[PDB]
Amino acid sequence: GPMSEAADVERVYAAMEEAAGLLGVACARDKIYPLLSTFQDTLVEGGSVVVFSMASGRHSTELDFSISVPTSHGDPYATVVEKGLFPATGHPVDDLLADTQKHLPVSMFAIDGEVTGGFKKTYAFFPTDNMPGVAELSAIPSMPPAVAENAELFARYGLDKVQMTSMDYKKRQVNLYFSELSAQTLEAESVLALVRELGLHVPNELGLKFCKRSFSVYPTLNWETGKIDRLCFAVISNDPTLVPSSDEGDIEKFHNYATKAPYAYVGEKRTLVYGLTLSPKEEYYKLGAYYHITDVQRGLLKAFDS
Numbered sequence: 001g002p003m004s005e006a007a008d009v010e011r012v013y014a015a016m017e018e019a020a021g022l023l024g025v026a027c028a029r030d031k032i033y034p035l036l037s038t039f040q041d042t043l044v045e046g047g048s049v050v051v052f053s054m055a056s057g058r059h060s061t062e063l064d065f066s067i068s069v070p071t072s073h074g075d076p077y078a079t080v081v082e083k084g085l086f087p088a089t090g091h092p093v094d095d096l097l098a099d100t101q102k103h104l105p106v107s108m109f110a111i112d113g114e115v116t117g118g119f120k121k122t123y124a125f126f127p128t129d130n131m132p133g134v135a136e137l138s139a140i141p142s143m144p145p146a147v148a149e150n151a152e153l154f155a156r157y158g159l160d161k162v163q164m165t166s167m168d169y170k171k172r173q174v175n176l177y178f179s180e181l182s183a184q185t186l187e188a189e190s191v192l193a194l195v196r197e198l199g200l201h202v203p204n205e206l207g208l209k210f211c212k213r214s215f216s217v218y219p220t221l222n223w224e225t226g227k228i229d230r231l232c233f234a235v236i237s238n239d240p241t242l243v244p245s246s247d248e249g250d251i252e253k254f255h256n257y258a259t260k261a262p263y264a265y266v267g268e269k270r271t272l273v274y275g276l277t278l279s280p281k282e283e284y285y286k287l288g289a290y291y292h293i294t295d296v297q298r299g300l301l302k303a304f305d306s
């Protein structure tokens with residue numbers, strides 16, 4: 001009843017404080033709780049996906065929390081704007097989540113916030129048995145022109161089906177999360193040519209071996225130019241040692257987080273999603289530790305972590 005529901009949200013907040021504390025990061029409750037409360041239904045429903053994510057380098061003092069939201073709830077961006085939890089940008093990115101649902105089957109939403117800066121992003125998931133390609137995404141009027149402008153490039157590298165998108169309202173950026181990646185797409189020669197053609201940081205062999213393991217690859221695009229801002233390779237695993245860095249500080253920090261981050265499906269091993277992010281000037285690493293998982297993550301582990 002009402003007690004147990006309120007306690008579930010409190011438990012999620014306490015887990016988020018714990019995860020942030022592994023980084024030395026303090027949590028602002030009056031920034032986080034209104035957002036959690038706004039989406040308390042989704043946190044008690046039980047098909048919940050909740051991830052607490054950290055990053056290396058200049059992003060090392062941030063903790064992001066991502067929470068799935070069913071489409072039955074209605075567009076989550078409209079909710080956060082109408083409740084005053086985020087100021088509308090006045091930019092096409094405001095329209096894009098709604099526009100996407102207007103044009104394509106969306107199977108689920110998600111939101112993302114940071115413990116210090118509050119709400120930052122929304123996600124649109126497509127059904128796994130019915131994902132769009134680049135051409136269908138380009139039919140959405142509020143999609144950045146950059147998506148269509150990079151269509152020939154995406155096709156040349158085998159970046160075809162998109163499992164989900166994300167919208168970053170503060171940076172006015174979109175991520176396309178490509179799925180069903182061929183082995184040719186992820187071989188070293190392909191990844192190198194892609195990264196070089198985009199003008200991004202060239203990885204070393206440790207990074208390339210990580211890339212070969214990827215289950216998802218996501219470029220970031222914007223509405224100002226057709227240049228991709230950065231490119232990320234994602235690896236899902238129960239292995240806590242996979243951060244693709246030779247720096248001992250990174251190796252220790254990520255293993256620490258991967259073995260201590262809170263989660264509620266105790267009796268299983270933690271689901272981890274690692275990221276290798278390449279921008280024009282730098283490489284950096286990400287690690288989301290899932291607090292709540294579903295069959296989707298378990299299936300990805302079976303397919304990609306066996």
Ligand SMILES: CC(C)=CCC/C(C)=C\COP(=O)(O)OP(=O)(O)O
Pocket residue numbers: 049050051053066067068110112121123166168175220288
């Ligand atoms: C609820 C679910 C399954 C959502 C996944 C959220 C997540 C932490 C990964 C997506 O990349 P990102 O949003 O961290 O990318 P970027 O760093 O470019 O914002």
